Amino acid sequence: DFEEKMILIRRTARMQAGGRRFRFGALVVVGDRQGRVGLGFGKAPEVPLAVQKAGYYARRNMVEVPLQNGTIPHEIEVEFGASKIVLKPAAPGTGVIAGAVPRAILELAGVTDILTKELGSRNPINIAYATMEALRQLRTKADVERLRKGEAHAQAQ
RNA sequence: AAAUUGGAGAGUUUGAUCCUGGCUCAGGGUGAACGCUGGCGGCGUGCCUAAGACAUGCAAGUCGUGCGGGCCGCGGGGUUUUAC
Ligand SMILES: [Mg+2]
Numbered sequence: 001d002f003e004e005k006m007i008l009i010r011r012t013a014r015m016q017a018g019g020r021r022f023r024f025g026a027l028v029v030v031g032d033r034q035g036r037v038g039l040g041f042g043k044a045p046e047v048p049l050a051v052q053k054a055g056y057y058a059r060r061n062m063v064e065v066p067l068q069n070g071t072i073p074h075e076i077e078v079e080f081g082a083s084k085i086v087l088k089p090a091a092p093g094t095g096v097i098a099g100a101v102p103r104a105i106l107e108l109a110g111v112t113d114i115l116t117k118e119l120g121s122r123n124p125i126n127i128a129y130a131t132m133e134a135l136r137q138l139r140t141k142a143d144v145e146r147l148r149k150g151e152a153h154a155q156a157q
Numbered sequence: 158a159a160a161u162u163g164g165a166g167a168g169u170u171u172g173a174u175c176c177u178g179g180c181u182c183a184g185g186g187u188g189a190a191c192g193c194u195g196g197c198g199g200c201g202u203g204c205c206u207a208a209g210a211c212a213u214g215c216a217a218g219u220c221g222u223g224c225g226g227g228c229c230g231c232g233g234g235g236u237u238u239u240a241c
């Protein structure tokens with residue numbers, strides 16, 4: 001029970017003697033606007049069917065974004081193939097200043113203020129993935145402190 | 158140049174795809190010009206070209222408490238032919 005978004009829809013061709021033969025691809029985001037978002041890419045031979053598919057997939061591929069007051073805990077830059085996303089967190093009332101794709105993903109995550117640039121290939125699908133991977137990677141003076149102290153944590157805390 | 162105050166992309170090579178890569182667009186700006194249209198005010202601002210040629214008018218004068226005198230006169234005096 002999340003909101004869904006359409007990143008993008010495309011049509012694609014095979015070949016058989018006597019014609020092209022088509023298939024559809026849907027890129028779908030799914031969020032609960034409070035720190036959980038999932039991305040799904042589904043292909044079927046019919047467009048709405050593909051989206052259904054896509055939506056199913058999205059919910060299985062879910063990522064808990066640690067939102068820190070409308071924004072993300074530190075800056076971060078992530079490459080995926082040719083494509084590369086940068087996420088710089090921002091102050092209140094800044095807005096999601098991000099491209100076409102990352103926005104949709106960020107918005108449904110529950111993010112409200114954040115800085116962004118795409119870089120390298122701009123391909124939707126990889127930018128989609130680079131963003132989801134970027135968010136999959138964020139940590140906290142908390143998340144981090146446990147990793148480093150860790151090996152005797154709870155002596156100082 | 159004292160809240161980390163700040164960063165959006167899209168179209169286009171293929172039957173489709175990923176990359177490379179160039180082309181192109183949306184933004185902001187002007188000592189602007191051109192089209193269509195044009196009610197009022199305030200503040201700015203107006204030869205970017207031939208540093209080409211220039212009619213006319215004005216654009217640096219002032220001091221008589223530094224000094225003598227020409228011209229046109231006003232008074233007021235002394236005085237050898239009523240001129241000095
Ligand atoms: Mg986490």
Ligand SMILES: [Mg+2]
Pocket residue numbers: 081082
């Ligand atoms: Mg690379």
Ligand SMILES: [Mg+2]
Pocket residue numbers: 089090091
């Ligand atoms: Mg902050």
Ligand SMILES: [Mg+2]
Pocket residue numbers: 120121
């Ligand atoms: Mg490129």
Ligand SMILES: [Mg+2]
Pocket residue numbers: 122
């Ligand atoms: Mg491009």
Ligand SMILES: [Mg+2]
Pocket residue numbers: 170
């Ligand atoms: Mg070729």
Ligand SMILES: [Mg+2]
Pocket residue numbers: none
């Ligand atoms: Mg074609």
Ligand SMILES: [Mg+2]
Pocket residue numbers: none
């Ligand atoms: Mg303009």
Ligand SMILES: [Mg+2]
Pocket residue numbers: none
């Ligand atoms: Mg007119």
Ligand SMILES: [Mg+2]
Pocket residue numbers: none
């Ligand atoms: Mg001239």
Ligand SMILES: [Mg+2]
Pocket residue numbers: none
């Ligand atoms: Mg000139």
Ligand SMILES: [Mg+2]
Pocket residue numbers: none
């Ligand atoms: Mg002259």
Ligand SMILES: [Mg+2]
Pocket residue numbers: 222
């Ligand atoms: Mg004197």
